[PDB]
Design a protein around this ligand. Sequence first.
Ligand SMILES: *Cc1c(COP(=O)(O)O)cnc(C)c1O
Ligand SMILES: *Cc1c(COP(=O)(O)O)cnc(C)c1O
Ligand SMILES: [Mg+2]
Ligand SMILES: [Mg+2]
Lengths: 318, 329
Amino acid sequence: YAADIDSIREAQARIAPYVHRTPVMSSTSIDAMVGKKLFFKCECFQKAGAFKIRGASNSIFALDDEQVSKGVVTHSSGNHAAAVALAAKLRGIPAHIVIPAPSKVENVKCYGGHIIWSDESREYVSKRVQEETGAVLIHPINSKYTISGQGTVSLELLEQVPEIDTIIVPISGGGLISGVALAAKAINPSIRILAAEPKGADDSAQSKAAGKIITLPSTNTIADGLRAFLGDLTWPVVRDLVDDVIVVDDTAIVDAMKMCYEILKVAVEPSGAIGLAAALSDEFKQSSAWHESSKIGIIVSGGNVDLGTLWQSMYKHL
Amino acid sequence: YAADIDSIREAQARIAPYVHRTPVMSSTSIDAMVGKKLFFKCECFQKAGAFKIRGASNSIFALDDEQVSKGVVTHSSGNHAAAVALAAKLRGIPAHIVIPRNAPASKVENVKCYGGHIIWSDASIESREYVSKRVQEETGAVLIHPINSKYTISGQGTVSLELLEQVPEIDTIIVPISGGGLISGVALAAKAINPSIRILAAEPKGADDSAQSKAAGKIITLPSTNTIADGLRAFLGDLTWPVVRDLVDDVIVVDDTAIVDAMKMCYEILKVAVEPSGAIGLAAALSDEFKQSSAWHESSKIGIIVSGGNVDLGTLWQSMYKHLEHHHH
Ligand SMILES: *Cc1c(COP(=O)(O)O)cnc(C)c1O
Ligand SMILES: *Cc1c(COP(=O)(O)O)cnc(C)c1O
Ligand SMILES: [Mg+2]
Ligand SMILES: [Mg+2]
C-alpha cells in the first residue's frame, strides 16, 4: 500500500511538535442510544479546525531543504487550504493557495497563506504557479505523505482507548480512512474499519460494491467536505482494509450534528458529524459489525462551519 | 467564610466518583487578540452541561441516609434544576424540582432526562419559594441551594483545585457571576493555594448587581434585569457576598453584544458549543475595561471558566433542515 506502519510512525515523529494530540470524548446518553460504547476522536479540536494539518504537515516537513525552498502550492475550496497554509507557516516557507469558496478563506489569511484567486481554472492557475515558482504540490488525499500523516489519528486513538474494536471514519477522497485503517490494522488486525458516506455522494460505497473506482457526474450533499472521489492510492485501502461503507442521508447528518452540539457540546461541521450518523443508523444497527462490536471509535473530522444564520438572529434579537 | 480549603478538599473527594475532571483548552488566535495566554476550563463538558453538578453532588452526597430518605428539593428555571435531578439520580433518591410554568422547554427536558419529579409554579421568585416551602412541609425534603450554602460553594471550589493543578502557572481567573457560588468556591480554593492569584468576575451590563454591590460595600439588587445571559440574572446571597467583597479584585461588566461576539468566538475558534452565560468570561477578557486595567498589565496566564453549554439552538437546526431540502432540490 501507499503507506505502512513504518511511514505512519515516521509521520508521528515528524509532526509531533506541530499538531495537537486531540482529546477523546464520550457520552453515556449517546452510548445508550447506540447500545455500544462510543469514543469520539475530536479532530475538530486539531489546529485549523480539522485533521488535515497532520497530512499537510507530514508532506511539507518531509521535503528536503532544496525542495521546500521553492514553497508549496495547492488548490482547494475547503479545509485543506488552511491546513497547507499553517503547515507552511510552521515550516517557514511560502504557501501559494489557489482559491476556489465560502469562512474557509478567513482561515487561510489567519495563517498568512498567499492567496491566488481562481474562477479547469483552478488547475490552470495552480499549473501556472507551479511552472513559474517550482512550488511543490501538496495533495489533499492521494499521496504517501498525507495518508501517512492521517494515520497518526489511529496511533493516538489506540493509545488513548486500547480496547477499541471498530472505527467509523468519514470518507471523501479516502486519505483519512486509508491512514486510519493502515495504522489500526497493523496494531491489531481484528479491528474493523467502517466508512461513513452521504447518500448524495455515495461513490465509495458504489466503488466497493462494484469492485472498481466509481465516479459520479455530480454530488448532492450538505457535507461540503465529502464530495470528492477516491484516488488511485486510497481505493486499494478502501477495497481491502475497510469492511464496509455505511451510507446515510443528509437529514441523519444534521440529526447527528445536532447531537454533537447539544449532548457533547462540540461545534462540529456536518462532514465531521457523519461518523455518528453512521453509528446511529439502522443499516449499522441491523448488521453483523454491530453485533461483533463493543468499543467503537468515531472520528470527528472537523469543525469549520459557517453559523452566520445563528449569529444574525442573535444580533437581531439585540 | 462559609467554606474553606478543607471543605473544598472534602468536596473533591466526595464528588470525584460522580463528576468529570474537565479539560483545559487554549487557542493561539484568541491569545494574540488579548495579548495574554488564555486557558479555558471547560465546564460546558461537565455532566448535565454545566459546573453545577459539583455543588449539587456535594450537597446531596454529604447528607446521611435519613436526611436523604425524604428526598431533595430546589426551585430553578435553569441549569441548577437539572444538576439537582442528576445528583439525586446518582444517589438514587427523589428530587422535587420546582420549576416556573413558563421555563424554557430545553431546561425542562434536561430535568426529565434525569427523572426529576417536577412541581410546577408561577413565574415570580415568591411563587417558586412558596411552592418550594410547601414541598418541604409535605415531604421534609432537604433544600439544595443553587448559590448560597457551604456545600454548594465547596463543590464549586473543586473547579479551582482542578484548574490550578492542570495549569499551575495561572495568575488570574475570570469567572462568570450570578448568585456568586461559582466565584466564591473558585476564589476560596485558589487563594488558599495561592493568595496572590487575581480573581475577576464577569457580569452582564443588564444584570450588574455584583459590580454595584462591590462599589456600595453591601448587597445591592436591581428592579429588573435585561440580558441574553440567562444564567446570570440572580443576586448575591449572604454567604457569597463576603467572598466577593474580600477575595474578588474586580467585576468586569460587559454588554450583550460583547457576549454574543465572545460566544461566536467560542464556536468558531475553540469549537465549543457554549451557552451565552458560559462565554462571558471571554467577553471580559476581550473588553477595553479589562485591557486597560491594572490586572491586565500584571497578568500573564489567565484562566477563563467556561461555565456551561446548555443553549437552545432551535433556530440553527430549523435553518439547516430547510437548507438541506433546498440543496436536494
Ligand atoms: C476532507 C475532509 C474529510 C474527508 O477526508 P478524505 O481524506 O478526503 O476522505 C472528512 N471530514 C472533514 C471535516 C474534511 O475536511
Ligand atoms: C448559574 C450559572 C452561572 C453562575 O453561577 P453562580 O454560582 O450563580 O454565580 C454561570 N454560568 C452558567 C452556565 C450557569 O448555569
Ligand atoms: Mg463519496
Ligand atoms: Mg448580576
